[PDB]
């Protein structure tokens, strides 16, 4: 199938959605803006994150550990990132307050 | 020597001993037929010296203007100086468009014309309306890098078979019982492991020997490997005093220039300025024979025309084409001659001398490519034994090489090695049982070469032998010197046991790799410095200053009636068969008569040798 | 007249010599008794001082990619590289970079050319029995696309200089294969131009290239592998 | 071919055969430095993110608490405004050299003169963007 081509394409996508997902959260901030820019930056990262580990660990057995411990940080920093939106001030806010000193 | 050397025995169908254009044609052939081949190469077969070929092949199809292999044929022939054998001329010239069509159906990207199909040009030597007519266009080009593209394309398509290719493997030596072949052993250059690669038919397509002369446009790699072979192995070569020095190969480095860019309007010029091709050539002018260019060339210098600093060299213009023709079809030898002469093929003319190009001579071989013997005056076939390409003699270039007409000849002379393998044997003959200690006397020439404590370099001896071939056997000879050179040669073989090598290893030892492709040169050297002293005519690019004629049967310029039919033993139409007493490196010369028949007398009638004048 | 004398460090390794470990070997050359590239350096090192240097070399003009190796850092053809005459530097002559040495320069390349090998680097047609009888036709616009395409001489400086061919050279084929299978795919008179590209839907035939473009600097001959790939990519993304 | 790529490896591995240097000795070439410092950055990037992510789900508190708890502990005009620029260096360069990589994925701009204009400007971009963040 095109299990590769299809990887490689849907990686793109996402880096632009990023792209244009992260100035207009700064043009008009949005809880559902806050909730989908946490999905992409943990698609985004989980993606990258597994090339880097595609690239550096080789064997097929501990490359899917890896693999599987990386499904586990991402499954994880995105309950975080809803948590924090759902219960804190969200992405946007908190940023701002930051950069607010 | 002995079990210091554990011998690995391989038993194919087929070896091919060589992975130029015509080594890997002929292996890609037994391939695709089903033999089982094993090709051979002491390089990456994509390595070999064809890819240095810019310039088409010549085909008679009739792309550009309406054209007859027939007219091709003849201008062969008339090209070669009648010592060519018209038989092996007649098949190739009525093969070379079925065989340039198969190449481009294989992928090789032949420059495209108007109308989708193989562009064509003009190179030196060709005609029309036999003869009568004028420059054809018969060189179907891939964009001046003719030779790299047939190499890529026959080495790529012949990984679609199951040739099982030896690369880097050196070969020593045929495995001769019984007067037949029963194939090679060879050297592995990475581990330096004797292997003996038997099989049922050898093809010998090693390539030429140009290293022999000090400058040449030759690979390091053309070192009369086969030709060497078939001398130890006590069969003849044949008219290897002819040695073409194609005349426009760089003054300093003897790197190549394309005939095709004068094809395309190039002009040599002197230090006049002026195309002295029409004073020697009236109608041919810069596109002739390249025997007649370089000894023109020579004969402007001689007289002092030479346009060089130090008036040792003649000018080449291109500038005069326009820049869009200079680098669609010759982007090549643009960069070529900006990177090594730094001239500008736009701008500046680029500086060119006569090096050694092409060997016309070779192990002899019928159009078939079986190589022959010569027993009590008969032409007999060694069984088991092929040659193509440079390494070969069919004679279909004779005493000289129309330009296009080498890439033809290895397409057209490997396919003609495999279609008489595949038509004499069939695929799984058992290999006879080889004795158990055949190829010996390889192994311990090897040893006694890699542990050859003495006093002369393998590098001096080379440039020894080098510079008295640059001296003795040059574009221009005569017997006062060709004497000296024959001496100076015989002195230096007999030298070849002081030889003082410095690397002892078994794993890419190429001290031993360059000791044994010097015991092939020298062996080349012999006999072709001694089949120039012997040939009392001028012929061809063998030209001589105390014999300015070309002696025939009859004096063709005058009327053929009344004359005498001078004796064989007389005349000197007649190819030189050399054999060399490894020994005592002495060299016993017969001769043998020039095949003139046809292969189909009523299709094309034998021409009859005349004036060759261009 | 008064000798220029340039400092040549070249990788040794001796297979034979038991224990031996590679070093770097100085040898001054003299600049007016050789010529002008750094293969005649390499070449009169061996024939006029140390019989013993080992590297490949076949054509002396650039045309084949046998003298391939890695000169002051950088993998260039050594019969086209001009020897720096600045006499206060030493050329640092290294093999290919992260392969398996045979002796001093010659990198074993056996895998480079297994995976040409697994391309199918030739012409593959739907109906094979018209071969040889007919002159294929190609325009001259769809001649043109296999142009800076078709030069390559399989030198491998381009793959021994990409950092993903290094990681993984087991399993991803590298800019000059995969510039191949390109040149192959983008050929007028192929007709498996849909299963040329099927063979590279695995995570590391192609999709170990991450644009460094180490490839199309490296090559001698001028030519762009990486542009190459991403022609691929795209290709398999819009098939 | 399988068996010629099994045997290379089969027989390289098991033997004494050196492997060639190539880091060390390869020059660094600039986009060969930027590309490893976008997988640099990346890693960095996605780093940070996971993190505060973990810390969103275990650390006890809010954000405006930990936010004040560092504002009480003043640092000055000078340590924000490089603190910030340290902060989002790696995600100004990062963005723009991806937008260089999808650039170059639609094939374009993949000529030796054009890789070194390209990195000049993301350079530049990059640090332009960077102060420009860091000083709102
Ligand atoms: C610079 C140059 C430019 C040319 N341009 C043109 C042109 O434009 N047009 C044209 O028609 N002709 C041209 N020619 C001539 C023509 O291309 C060559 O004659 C032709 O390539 C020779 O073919 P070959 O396969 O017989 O020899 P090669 O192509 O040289 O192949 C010889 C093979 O034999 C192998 N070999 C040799 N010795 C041994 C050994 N001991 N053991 C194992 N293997 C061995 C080598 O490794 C190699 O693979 C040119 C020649 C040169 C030098
Ligand atoms: C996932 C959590 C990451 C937290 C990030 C904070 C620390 C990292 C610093 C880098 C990101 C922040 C720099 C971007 C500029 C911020 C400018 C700003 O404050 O403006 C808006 C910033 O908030 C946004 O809406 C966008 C926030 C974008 C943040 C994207 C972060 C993704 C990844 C960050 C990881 C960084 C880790 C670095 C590690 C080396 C707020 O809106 P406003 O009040 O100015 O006016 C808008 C309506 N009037
Ligand atoms: C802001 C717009 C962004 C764009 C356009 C972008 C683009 C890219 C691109 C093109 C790649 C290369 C993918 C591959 O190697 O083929 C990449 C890698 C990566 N990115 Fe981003 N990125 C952005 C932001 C982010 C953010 C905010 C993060 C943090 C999670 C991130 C994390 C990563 C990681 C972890 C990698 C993998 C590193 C590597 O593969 O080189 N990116 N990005
Ligand atoms: C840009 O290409 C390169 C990398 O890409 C990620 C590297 O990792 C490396 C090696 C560096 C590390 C930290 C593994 C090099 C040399 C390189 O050129
Ligand atoms: S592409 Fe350029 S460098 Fe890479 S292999 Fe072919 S020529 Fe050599
Ligand atoms: S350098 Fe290597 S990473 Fe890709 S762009 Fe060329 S193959
Ligand atoms: S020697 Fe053939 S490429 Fe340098």
Redesign the interface.
């Known amino acids: 199938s095109k299990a590769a081509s299809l990887h490689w394409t849907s990686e793109r996508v996402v880096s632009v959605l990023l792209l244009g997902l992260l100035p207009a959260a700064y043009l008009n901030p949005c809880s559902a803006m806050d909730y989908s820019l946490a999905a992409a930056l943990t698609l985004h990262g989980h993606w990258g994150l597994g090339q880097v580990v595609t690239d550096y660990v080789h064997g097929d057995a501990l490359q899917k550990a890896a693999k599987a411990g990386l499904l586990a940080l991402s499954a994880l920093t995105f309950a975080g990132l809803c948590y924090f939106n759902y219960h804190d001030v969200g992405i946007c806010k908190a940023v701002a307050m930051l950069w607010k000193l | 020597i002995s079990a210091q050397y554990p011998v690995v025995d391989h038993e194919f169908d087929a070896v091919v001993v060589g992975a130029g254009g015509a080594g890997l044609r002929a292996a890609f052939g037994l391939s695709e037929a089903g033999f089982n081949t094993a090709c051979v190469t002491k390089?990456?077969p994509?390595?070999?010296?064809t890819?240095?070929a810019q310039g088409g092949i010549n085909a008679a199809?009739g792309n550009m203007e309406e054209d007859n292999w027939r007219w091709h044929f003849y201008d062969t022939v008339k090209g070669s100086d009648w010592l060519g054998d018209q038989d092996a001329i007649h098949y190739m010239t009525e093969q070379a468009p079925?065989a340039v069509?198969?190449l481009?159906?294989?992928?090789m990207?032949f420059?495209?014309?108007?109308?989708?199909?193989?562009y064509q040009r003009a190179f030196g030597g060709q005609s029309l309306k036999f003869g009568k007519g004028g420059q054809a266009h018969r060189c179907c080009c891939v964009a001046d890098?003719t030779g790299?593209?047939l190499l890529?394309?026959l080495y790529?398509?012949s990984?679609?078979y199951d040739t099982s290719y030896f690369?880097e493997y050196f070969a020593l030596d045929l495995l001769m019982e019984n007067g037949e072949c029963r194939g090679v052993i060879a050297l592995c250059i990475?581990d330096g492991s004797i292997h003996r690669i038997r099989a049922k038919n050898t093809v010998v397509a090693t390539g030429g020997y140009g290293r022999t002369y000090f400058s040449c446009t030759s690979?390091?790699?053309s070192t009369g490997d086969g030709t060497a072979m078939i001398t130890r192995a006590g069969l003849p070569c044949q008219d290897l005093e002819f040695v073409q020095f194609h005349p426009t190969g760089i003054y300093g480095?003897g790197?190549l220039i394309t005939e095709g860019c004068r094809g395309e309007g190039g002009i040599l010029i002197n230090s006049q300025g002026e195309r002295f091709m029409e004073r020697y050539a009236p109608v041919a002018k810069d596109l002739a024979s390249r025997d007649v260019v370089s000894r023109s060339m020579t004969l402007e210098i001689r007289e002092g025309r030479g346009c060089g600093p130090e008036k040792d060299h003649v000018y080449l213009q291109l500038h005069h084409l326009p820049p869009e023709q200079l680098a669609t079809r010759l982007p090549?030898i643009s960069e070529?001659a900006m990177?090594?002469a730094g001239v500008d093929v736009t701008k500046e003319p680029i500086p060119v001398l006569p090096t050694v190009h092409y060997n016309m001579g070779g192990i002899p071989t019928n159009y078939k490519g079986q190589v022959l013997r010569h027993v009590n005056g008969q032409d007999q076939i060694v069984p088991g034994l092929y040659a193509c390409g440079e390494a070969a003699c069919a004679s279909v270039h004779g005493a000289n090489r129309l330009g296009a007409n080498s890439l033809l000849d290895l397409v057209v002379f490997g396919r003609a090695c495999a279609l008489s393998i595949e038509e004499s044997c069939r695929p799984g003959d058992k290999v006879p049982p080889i004795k158990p200690n055949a190829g010996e006397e390889s192994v311990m020439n090897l040893d006694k070469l890699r542990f050859a404590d003495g006093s002369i370099?393998?590098?001096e001896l080379r440039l020894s032998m080098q510079k008295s071939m640059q001296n003795h056997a040059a574009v221009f000879r005569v017997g006062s010197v060709l004497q000296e050179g024959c001496g100076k040669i015989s002195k230096l073989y007999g030298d070849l046991k002081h030889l003082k090598?410095?690397?002892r290893?078994?794993?890419?030892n190429?001290?031993l790799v360059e000791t044994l492709e010097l015991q092939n040169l020298m062996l080349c050297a012999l006999q072709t410095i001694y089949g120039a002293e012997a040939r009392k005519e001028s012929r061809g690019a063998h030209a001589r200053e105390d014999y300015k004629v070309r002696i025939d049967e009859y004096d063709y310029s005058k009327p053929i009636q009344g004359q005498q039919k001078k004796p064989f033993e007389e005349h000197w139409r007649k190819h030189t068969l050399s054999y060399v007493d490894v020994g005592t490196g002495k060299v016993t010369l017969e001769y043998r008569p020039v095949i003139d028949k046809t292969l189909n007398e009523a299709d094309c009638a034998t021409v009859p040798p005349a004036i060759r004048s261009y | 007249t008064a000798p220029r004398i340039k400092k040549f460090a070249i990788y040794r390794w001796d297979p034979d010599k038991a224990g031996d470990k590679p070093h770097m070997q100085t040898y001054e050359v003299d600049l007016n008794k050789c010529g002008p590239m750094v293969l005649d350096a390499l070449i009169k090192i061996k024939n006029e001082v140390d019989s013993t240097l080992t590297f490949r070399r076949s054509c002396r003009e650039g045309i084949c990619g046998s003298c391939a190796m890695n000169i002051n850092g950088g993998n260039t053809l050594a019969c086209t590289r001009r020897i720096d005459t600045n006499l206060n530097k030493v050329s640092k002559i290294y093999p290919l970079p992260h392969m398996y040495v045979i002796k001093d320069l010659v990198p074993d390349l056996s895998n480079f050319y297994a995976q040409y090998k697994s391309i199918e680097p030739y012409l593959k047609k739907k109906d094979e029995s018209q071969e040889g009888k007919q002159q294929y036709l190609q325009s001259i616009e769809e001649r043109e696309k296999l142009d800076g395409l078709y030069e390559c001489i399989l030198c491998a400086c381009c793959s021994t200089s990409c950092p993903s061919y290094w990681w993984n050279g087991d399993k991803y084929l590298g800019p000059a294969v995969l510039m191949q299978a390109y040149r192959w795919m983008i050929d007028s008179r192929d007709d498996f131009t849909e299963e040329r590209l099927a063979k590279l839907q695995d995570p590391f035939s192609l999709y170990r290239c991450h644009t460094i473009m180490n490839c199309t600097r490296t090559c001698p001959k001028g030519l762009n592998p990486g542009k190459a790939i991403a022609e691929i990519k795209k290709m398999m993304a819009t098939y | 071919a399988k068996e010629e790529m099994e045997r290379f490896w089969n027989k390289n591995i098991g033997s004494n055969r050196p492997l060639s240097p190539h880091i060390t000795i390869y020059s660094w070439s600039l986009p060969m430095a930027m590309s490893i410092c976008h997988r640099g950055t990346g890693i960095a990037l996605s780093a940070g993110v996971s993190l505060f992510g973990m810390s969103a789900l275990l650390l006890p508190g809010n954000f405006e608490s930990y936010l004040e708890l560092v504002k009480s502990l003043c640092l000055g005009p000078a340590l924000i405004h490089t603190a910030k620029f340290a902060l989002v260096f790696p995600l100004m360069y990062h963005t723009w050299n991806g937008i260089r990589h999808l650039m170059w994925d639609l094939g374009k701009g993949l000529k030796i003169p054009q890789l070194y204009q390209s990195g000049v400007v993301v350079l530049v971009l990059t640090v332009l963007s960077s102060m420009g963040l860091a000083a709102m």
Do not use: Q
């Open positions: 390089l990456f994509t390595r070999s010296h890819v240095a199809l079925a069509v198969e481009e159906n294989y992928g990207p420059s495209r014309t108007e109308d989708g199909k193989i890098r790299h593209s890529h394309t790529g398509r990984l679609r690369v990475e690979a390091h790699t480095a790197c090549g070529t990177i090594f370099r393998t590098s090598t410095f690397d290893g078994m794993v890419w190429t001290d």
